Amino acid sequence: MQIFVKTLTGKTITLEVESSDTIDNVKSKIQDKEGIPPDQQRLIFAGKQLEDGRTLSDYNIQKESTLHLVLRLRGG
Amino acid sequence: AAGEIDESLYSRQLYVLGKEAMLKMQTSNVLILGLKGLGVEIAKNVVLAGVKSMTVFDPEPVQLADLSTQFFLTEKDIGQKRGDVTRAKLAELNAYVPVNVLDSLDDVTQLSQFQVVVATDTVSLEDKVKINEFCHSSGIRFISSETRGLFGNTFVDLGDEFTVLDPTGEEPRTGMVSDIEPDGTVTMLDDNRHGLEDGNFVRFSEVEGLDKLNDGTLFKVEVLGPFAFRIGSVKEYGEYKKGGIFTEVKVPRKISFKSLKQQLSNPEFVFSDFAKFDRAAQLHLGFQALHQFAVRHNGELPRTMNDEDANELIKLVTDLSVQQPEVLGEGVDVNEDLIKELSYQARGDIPGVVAFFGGLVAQEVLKACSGKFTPLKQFMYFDSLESLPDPKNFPRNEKTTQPVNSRYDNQIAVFGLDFQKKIANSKVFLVGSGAIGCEMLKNWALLGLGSGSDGYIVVTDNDSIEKSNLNRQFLFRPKDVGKNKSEVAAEAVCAMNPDLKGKINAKIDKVGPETEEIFNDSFWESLDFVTNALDNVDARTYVDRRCVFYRKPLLESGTLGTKGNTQVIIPRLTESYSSSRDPPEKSIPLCTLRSFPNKIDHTIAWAKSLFQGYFTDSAENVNMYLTQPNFVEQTLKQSGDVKGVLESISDSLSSKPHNFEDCIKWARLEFEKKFNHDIKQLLFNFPKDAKTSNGEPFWSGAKRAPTPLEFDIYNNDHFHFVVAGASLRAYNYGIKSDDSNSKPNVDEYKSVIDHMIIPEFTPNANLKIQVNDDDPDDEIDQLVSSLPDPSTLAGFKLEPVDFEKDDDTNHHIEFITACSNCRAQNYFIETADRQKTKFIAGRIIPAIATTTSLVTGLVNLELYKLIDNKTDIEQYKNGFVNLALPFFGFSEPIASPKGEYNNKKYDKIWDRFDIKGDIKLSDLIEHFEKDEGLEITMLSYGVSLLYASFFPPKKLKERLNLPITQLVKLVTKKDIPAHVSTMILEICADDKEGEDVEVPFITIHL
C-alpha cells in the first residue's frame, strides 16, 4: 500500500509499505528518500507521535494515510 | 518615498515575507469589523506587519467583560466606544501605519475603499453574508473569524481569481548537475540530493552543449529518485557536454474561492487537528446553529452552562443534519456532547484561543494582500476541549461559572471561579522576554496569572531592546530602545492589567550554569511551573535540565518564520526536551571554504572569518602580548596554530599605520593578496586545464576554476572592500577616518590607490594545497626575535571590533558583503547584497508576530492542563505548525522511559535517590545495599571516580570513612564551593542476582 509523508515545508513523499512494517522501517525509507537520520525524524499521525518498535497497524495507518514529518524550532 | 522598506525596523519579518510581498502589503488598506479580543489581536499583528492603513469599526460600548482578552481596554474606558478607545493604542504599534476609525457601516459601499475586510465575532452571520457578497462580487478579499470559549473558526474568501505567487516561502532548491541524457534524465553531481518534488519547475545555467536550456525556460520536473529527475526530451537543444546548475522556480497559481453563502452549504475544510477531523463537520453545523439561536433570541447567545439553551442548540443542529444529510454524512449522528459544550461555552472569551485565531487570521490577511503563501481554503474549525479541568476538582455549573462583575467573567464562564483563582495563585517563571515572552506576558496578564495573594510571576532576560525587535515584541516602543526587555515588558502588562501591579518580578539575569546562586534551590522549588521563551537550544537544554532536577513542568515553544512548535514536559509522565535530538546545523567542509567555494554561503563564511582575524583576533593578540610577559612562552607550549599567532603579532606591529591613507593602502594590498595573488597561487598549483590521475578534469563539479581580480574602483565590491577594510583598520589603530562624518569619496580613495606601486605576484613552488579534508596538512625562533620588546610600545593598545550586524554605520556587514562578493567574483558565484549577507553572517532567524502569537496561544491552552495537574498523558498536546501552508498538527507527548532493578520500577528521567546530608561513603554503600538491594560498583562526581568495587583494601580504607565532600576533596584536590547545596553522583550497581543494572542517579543534599 502507498502512504504519504508531508513535511513541514510542504513537500510530499510517497512510500510503499505494508501494515505489518515497523515505524523503524518507515523511518529508514524516509532516510532513503530525504537523507534524514531516523533519530532526527518526528512523525505524527492522528494525534500520536510514531515511536520506534511499534508497527503501522498499532496507529491504525490505512492506505492513503498521510503522516506529517515535523520539527522543533529554535526562534523566540 | 514608497517602493523602499525600512530594513532597520522590519529586518526579521523581511526575511520571512520578502520585499515584493511587503511592497504589496504597503499598498493594501485593511478594515476590521469588531474590536473585542479577536479583532484587536488581528489588528495588532496586521499593524506590526506593515500595511498601508488599518481601519477599525466597533461602535459598541466597552463593558467590563470585554477585557477578558482585549488587552488595550481598561476599566476607565467602560461606556465609551471600543473602536475609538483602541485606535490610538494600535497606532503606537507602528508609526508607518495610520489607524482610522470607521464611524458607521450603514452604507456598505464604503467597503470599496479596502482591499481586505475582516469580520470578527461581533458581526452577525446575516451581515457577514451581505458583506461577503459585496466583497466577493467586487474584488475585495474577505475573511471572517469567531471564537466561542474553547472553540473557534475562520473563513477565507479571496474571490473568483486570486494568484498565489509562492506557495511555501522556502528557499528555491538548487543543485549541481553531472549529466543530462537526451530523454531529459538529469543526474546530480555525486551524492547531492535535488530535493525536488513532482510538478516543481526548474531553470538551468552553465549546462554546456544544450545552450538554450540555459535561457530561463522552465522545465517541469518528474522525480526519478533522490539523485535524478527528468525534464522531457532535450535532444532538440543539443548534446550535454559538462557543467550545470538547476534552480527551482515557483510558478504562479490561479485559484478560486466561493462565497460565504455557497460555503455555508458546501464547505471546503482545512483541519486544525487531524485527530479531530470528524468534528470539523459538526462544528460547521454548530456555529451556524449559534447564529440561528441568536436570531431566535434577539441577538443573544446561549446562556453559560445552561441546559435548556444547549438542548435548543442541539435541536437546531439536529435540524440542520436532517435538512442536509451529506453534511455529517449518511447515518452519522449529531455529536450531542460536542454541541452541548459549544452552547455551554458560547459566551467564553479565552486568551489562548483568541491568540491562536488572531495570529492565524492576521497571517491570512497578509497572504490576501500579497499572494505570498498558500491561503486557507476555506473554513477551519478548532477546539481545545482537553484544556477543560476535571469536573471532579472544578465543577462547572450555572453557579460556579456565573459572572462575578470582573474582567475575568468570560474566562470564568468556561472554567469556573475556583479554577480561575488557582490561576491567579500560580507561581510562574518565564525565561525570556522577547517575542514569545511579550506574547506570553500579555496572555498571562489577561489570565490574571499570578495576581492572587499566593501567586507571582518572575521573568528574566538579560538582553536590552533593539529597534528590529519592535516589529514583533509588541510591549516595546521606540523610546524603550536600549532598556531592559524584561523590565519594560513587566511594566507594560501592569498597565494592561493592574491586578499584576507588584506581582511581577522582572530580572535581568541570564539563566545558565553561572547564575545558580541567584536561581537557587529555594527559588526553583517554590515554583509551580516554568515557561521558556528562548532563542537558542543551549538555554533550552539548560532550563529543561533544571526542570528535571527540580521536578517542575516546563512549557516550551519556538518559531522560525511561519513555522512553530509547542512541547509540554511533565514530571513523572513525559520525555523532556533533551530526550530527543533535532537536526544539527550543516557544516561546510574546510577544503570548500579554503580553496573551492561554489555558493555564496561559502564565501560569506570565509569573509566573516577573515573579518574576525583582521579586526578582532589579531588585536586581542597584540594586547595579550603587550600585557603578558609570559605570552610568547605560553603560546609556544599551548596553541594549535603557533606560527599564525606570532605572524599576526608581527604583521600588526611592523605595518603600523600612521594615518587614514596608510589604512587605504593596507586595504588595497589586502585586496591584491586575497583576490589576485592567492588565486594565482591556487592556479599555479592547479592550472585551469589540469586533470586528475584518471585524466578527468580537476576543475569540475564543486570545483570552479577561479579568475584573479583586477582591482576596479568602479566595481561596487572592490570599492567597498577598501572602504570598509580601511575604516576598520583605522578603528583598530585609533586613527580618525576621512569618512567618520561623511560618505566615502571615490576620487579620494582613487588618487591614493592610483599612486601605489602594487607588487607583482611571484609563485611559491613549495606550497602544497590541501584538496580534501581526508589528505594531511624552527623557522619560529626568527619570528620571535623579530617581535618588538613591549617596553618600546608602552601604552600602545589596539581596539578590537565586536561584530555588530545591526548597526549599518559601523562597516561590518559592508566589509563582509564586499569581501564575500570579491571572492564570489573570483569563482564565478553570483554576488549577494547586504541584506542577504547579513542574514547568513549574522545567523538571523526569520521572525514575525503572527506565528509568535499563535504558538503562544497554543502554549497557554496547555498551561490550563498544568493548572489541573493532569496526569493522563493523552490530554496533553505537543503542537506543530506552519502558517504558510497552512498546517496545524498535534501529538500526545511521549511517555518517559521506565526501568526496573530488583522489584522496583523507576522513571529513567525523573527519578533519583535523594540522600539527606554529607553522608560518609561507607554509609552510602551500606544504605544502597540494605534499602535498595543495590551493590554499588562505581560512584562518580562528574569526571572523578570516587569509589569502585575493584579498589583494593588500602584504597578503600582512605575513603570509606569520608563524607562525600571530603571524598571529592581527596580525589580532585579542590574543595566543593560554599554556595553548592547539592551534588549529583552517578552510580553503577549490581542487583540482588549480581547483575549490572541501570539505576537512577543520586542527589546529595548538603
Ligand SMILES: *NS(=O)(=O)OC[C@H]1O[C@@H](n2cnc3c(Nc4cccc(C#C)c4)ncnc32)[C@H](O)[C@@H]1O
Ligand atoms: N526570540 S527572541 O529573540 O525574540 O526572544 C528570546 C529572548 O530570550 C533571551 N535569552 C536567551 N537565552 C537566555 C538565557 N540563557 C542562556 C543564554 C545562552 C546560553 C545559555 C546556556 C547554557 C543560557 N537566559 C535568559 N534569557 C535568555 C534573549 O535575550 C531574548 O530576549
Ligand SMILES: [Cl-]
Ligand atoms: Cl485618539
Ligand SMILES: [Cl-]
Ligand atoms: Cl451592512
Ligand SMILES: [Cl-]
Ligand atoms: Cl546560535
Ligand SMILES: [Cl-]
Ligand atoms: Cl517560513
